[PDB]
Enzyme design. Structure first.
Site, PDB file in Angstrom:
ATOM      1  N   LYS A  64       4.072   2.894  -7.373  1.00  0.00           N
ATOM      2  CA  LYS A  64       3.398   4.122  -7.580  1.00  0.00           C
ATOM      3  C   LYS A  64       2.223   4.382  -6.624  1.00  0.00           C
ATOM      4  CE  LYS A  64       0.152   2.984 -11.366  1.00  0.00           C
ATOM      5  NZ  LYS A  64      -0.177   3.315 -12.806  1.00  0.00           N
ATOM      6  N   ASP A  65       1.854   3.309  -5.907  1.00  0.00           N
ATOM      7  CA  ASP A  65       0.772   3.378  -4.956  1.00  0.00           C
ATOM      8  C   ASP A  65       1.324   3.580  -3.554  1.00  0.00           C
ATOM      9  OD1 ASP A  65      -1.316   2.814  -6.857  1.00  0.00           O
ATOM     10  OD2 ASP A  65      -1.213   0.714  -6.539  1.00  0.00           O
ATOM     11  N   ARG A 112      -2.090  12.392 -14.421  1.00  0.00           N
ATOM     12  CA  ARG A 112      -0.748  12.437 -15.065  1.00  0.00           C
ATOM     13  C   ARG A 112      -0.898  12.036 -16.538  1.00  0.00           C
ATOM     14  NH1 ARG A 112       2.231   8.160 -16.595  1.00  0.00           N
ATOM     15  NH2 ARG A 112       0.817   6.827 -15.379  1.00  0.00           N
ATOM     16  N   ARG A 113      -1.641  10.953 -16.771  1.00  0.00           N
ATOM     17  CA  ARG A 113      -1.876  10.461 -18.120  1.00  0.00           C
ATOM     18  C   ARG A 113      -2.719  11.439 -18.925  1.00  0.00           C
ATOM     19  NH1 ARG A 113      -2.718   4.230 -15.900  1.00  0.00           N
ATOM     20  NH2 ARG A 113      -0.634   3.570 -16.385  1.00  0.00           N
ATOM     21  N   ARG A 130     -12.118   3.651 -13.598  1.00  0.00           N
ATOM     22  CA  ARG A 130     -11.686   3.176 -12.336  1.00  0.00           C
ATOM     23  C   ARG A 130     -11.854   1.667 -12.283  1.00  0.00           C
ATOM     24  NH1 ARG A 130     -13.882   9.076 -10.366  1.00  0.00           N
ATOM     25  NH2 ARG A 130     -11.823   9.991 -10.896  1.00  0.00           N
ATOM     26  N   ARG A 136     -11.513  -3.013 -16.131  1.00  0.00           N
ATOM     27  CA  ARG A 136     -11.278  -1.910 -17.062  1.00  0.00           C
ATOM     28  C   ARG A 136     -11.292  -2.446 -18.514  1.00  0.00           C
ATOM     29  NH1 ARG A 136      -7.984   3.128 -15.142  1.00  0.00           N
ATOM     30  NH2 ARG A 136      -7.891   2.915 -12.865  1.00  0.00           N
ATOM     31  N   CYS A 223      -1.244   9.621  -6.152  1.00  0.00           N
ATOM     32  CA  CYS A 223      -1.910   9.206  -7.416  1.00  0.00           C
ATOM     33  C   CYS A 223      -2.921  10.180  -7.971  1.00  0.00           C
ATOM     34  CB  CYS A 223      -2.755   7.941  -7.194  1.00  0.00           C
ATOM     35  SG  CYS A 223      -1.815   6.493  -6.832  1.00  0.00           S
TER      36      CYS A 223
HETATM   37  C1  LIG Z   1      -1.066   5.938  -8.448  1.00  0.00           C
HETATM   38  C2  LIG Z   1      -1.945   5.290  -9.440  1.00  0.00           C
HETATM   39  N1  LIG Z   1      -2.381   4.041  -9.240  1.00  0.00           N
HETATM   40  C3  LIG Z   1      -3.069   3.652 -10.370  1.00  0.00           C
HETATM   41  C4  LIG Z   1      -3.712   2.014 -10.572  1.00  0.00           C
HETATM   42  C5  LIG Z   1      -2.603   1.028 -10.717  1.00  0.00           C
HETATM   43  N2  LIG Z   1      -1.721   0.793  -9.695  1.00  0.00           N
HETATM   44  C6  LIG Z   1      -0.795  -0.137 -10.120  1.00  0.00           C
HETATM   45  C7  LIG Z   1      -1.033  -0.502 -11.474  1.00  0.00           C
HETATM   46  C8  LIG Z   1      -0.225  -1.481 -12.298  1.00  0.00           C
HETATM   47  C9  LIG Z   1       1.091  -0.914 -12.825  1.00  0.00           C
HETATM   48  C10 LIG Z   1       2.242  -0.868 -11.820  1.00  0.00           C
HETATM   49  O1  LIG Z   1       2.446  -1.784 -11.023  1.00  0.00           O
HETATM   50  O2  LIG Z   1       2.965   0.101 -11.753  1.00  0.00           O
HETATM   51  C11 LIG Z   1      -2.209   0.274 -11.905  1.00  0.00           C
HETATM   52  C12 LIG Z   1      -2.979   0.290 -13.196  1.00  0.00           C
HETATM   53  C13 LIG Z   1      -2.374   0.713 -14.372  1.00  0.00           C
HETATM   54  O3  LIG Z   1      -1.807   1.791 -14.397  1.00  0.00           O
HETATM   55  O4  LIG Z   1      -2.377   0.007 -15.380  1.00  0.00           O
HETATM   56  C14 LIG Z   1      -3.090   4.673 -11.365  1.00  0.00           C
HETATM   57  C15 LIG Z   1      -3.721   4.678 -12.748  1.00  0.00           C
HETATM   58  C16 LIG Z   1      -4.979   5.494 -12.705  1.00  0.00           C
HETATM   59  C17 LIG Z   1      -5.745   5.511 -14.020  1.00  0.00           C
HETATM   60  O5  LIG Z   1      -5.203   5.495 -15.147  1.00  0.00           O
HETATM   61  O6  LIG Z   1      -6.941   5.594 -13.912  1.00  0.00           O
HETATM   62  C18 LIG Z   1      -2.326   5.774 -10.765  1.00  0.00           C
HETATM   63  C19 LIG Z   1      -1.959   7.118 -11.296  1.00  0.00           C
HETATM   64  C20 LIG Z   1      -1.061   7.238 -12.301  1.00  0.00           C
HETATM   65  O7  LIG Z   1      -0.654   6.220 -12.791  1.00  0.00           O
HETATM   66  O8  LIG Z   1      -0.603   8.340 -12.705  1.00  0.00           O
END
Ligand SMILES: *Cc1[nH]c(Cc2[nH]cc(CCC(=O)O)c2CC(=O)O)c(CCC(=O)O)c1CC(=O)O
EC number: 2.5.1.61
Length: 294
Positions: A64-65, A112-113, A130, A136, A223
């Site tokens: 997702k990153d 999104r959440r 963050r 967190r 993201c």
């Molecule tokens: C794009 C985006 N990145 C993140 C932070 C993040 N990146 C990877 C993970 C672990 C889960 C995985 O590998 O898929 C995480 C943290 C997590 O979601 O637990 C986010 C979350 C931002 C937030 O909630 O502040 C996002 C955006 C999104 O998920 O929509």
């Protein structure tokens, strides 16, 4: 040339992912010497710099990153077997979202959440959060929030599955593109490295993530965008759901596609275009502020 150098971020979760990939590599190629090059489109840029100047051979990311666009000569070449793709409700004092009283504080910086929580429960206060998973959880434990939303997969990987009070079904919180899957980026002309990675690709996950990403790419997502994009393989077909939402939950544009796996990319593009034409274009514009997907 027996060495493969992995570029990774330096968090506990990021290093767990670099080990996952290293272990799969060693299992398939017992002769390989795997080296880590930890460091740091937000995060991926430094990793991509290392690939372009030959300091690393692969970069490992959470899907997702992974950015929607790449510099000339690099690309996403491997999508690993998907773990649980769901969001998780995390709380010390409450057992579900349903149990939270009005005015409870829930932490997440994911639009999104946020848009989806706000759609259903406008009485809840959604506050930015963050940081790395461990940090967190500390802010939660310290009283900063009544609950937070994290990915199930991250928690499982870190040995923190005890923190999952409830997994949220995709119909409640539609996942980020490729949530739960690890992706690997390398130099596209590097046929040696790509041959070594072939054994790590999970075709079923790759089909799903293809659809999801095509959707996001057409929306010019990232993201920082209130976009859900999530596919499953059901009775030999890809079933893709998508959504774009106003962060305050006031309007959420949704759609779906079902079809043959070979059509994953065109399906996702088609769905994106449908959302765009049914109000998503305007929502995204108020987020990117001005810039709208063409
Ligand atoms: C794009 C985006 N990145 C993140 C932070 C993040 N990146 C990877 C993970 C672990 C889960 C995985 O590998 O898929 C995480 C943290 C997590 O979601 O637990 C986010 C979350 C931002 C937030 O909630 O502040 C996002 C955006 C999104 O998920 O929509």
């Amino acid at each position: 040339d027996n060495v493969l150098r992995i570029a990774t971020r330096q968090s506990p979760l990021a290093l767990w992912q670099a080990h996952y990939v290293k272990d799969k590599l060693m299992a398939s190629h017992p002769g390989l010497v795997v080296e880590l090059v930890p460091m740091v489109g937000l995060f991926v840029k430094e990793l991509e710099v290392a690939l372009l100047e030959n300091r690393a051979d692969i970069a490992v990311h959470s899907m997702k990153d992974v950015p929607v666009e790449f510099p000339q000569g690099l690309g996403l070449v491997t999508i690993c077997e998907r773990e649980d793709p769901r969001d998780a409700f995390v709380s010390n004092n409450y057992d579900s979202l349903d149990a939270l009283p009005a005015g409870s504080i829930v932490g997440t910086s994911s639009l999104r959440r946020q848009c989806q929580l706000a759609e259903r429960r406008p009485d809840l206060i959604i506050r930015s959060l963050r940081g790395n998973v461990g940090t967190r959880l500390s802010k939660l434990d310290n009283g900063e929030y009544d609950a937070i939303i994290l990915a199930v997969a991250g928690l499982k990987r870190l040995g923190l599955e005890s923190r999952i009070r409830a997994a949220l079904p995709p119909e409640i919180s539609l996942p980020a593109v490729g949530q739960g899957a690890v992706g690997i980026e390398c130099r596209l002309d590097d046929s040696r490295t790509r041959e070594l990675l072939a054994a790590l690709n999970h075709h079923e996950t790759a089909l799903r993530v293809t659809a999801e990403r095509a959707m996001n790419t057409r929306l010019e997502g990232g993201c920082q965008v209130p976009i859900g994009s999530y596919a499953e393989l059901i009775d030999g077909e890809i079933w893709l759901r998508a959504l774009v939402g106003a962060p305050d939950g006031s309007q959420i544009i949704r759609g779906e596609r079902r079809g043959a796996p070979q059509d994953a990319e065109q399906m996702g593009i088609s769905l994106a275009e449908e959302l765009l034409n049914n109000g998503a274009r305007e929502i995204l514009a108020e987020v990117y502020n001005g810039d709208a997907p063409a």
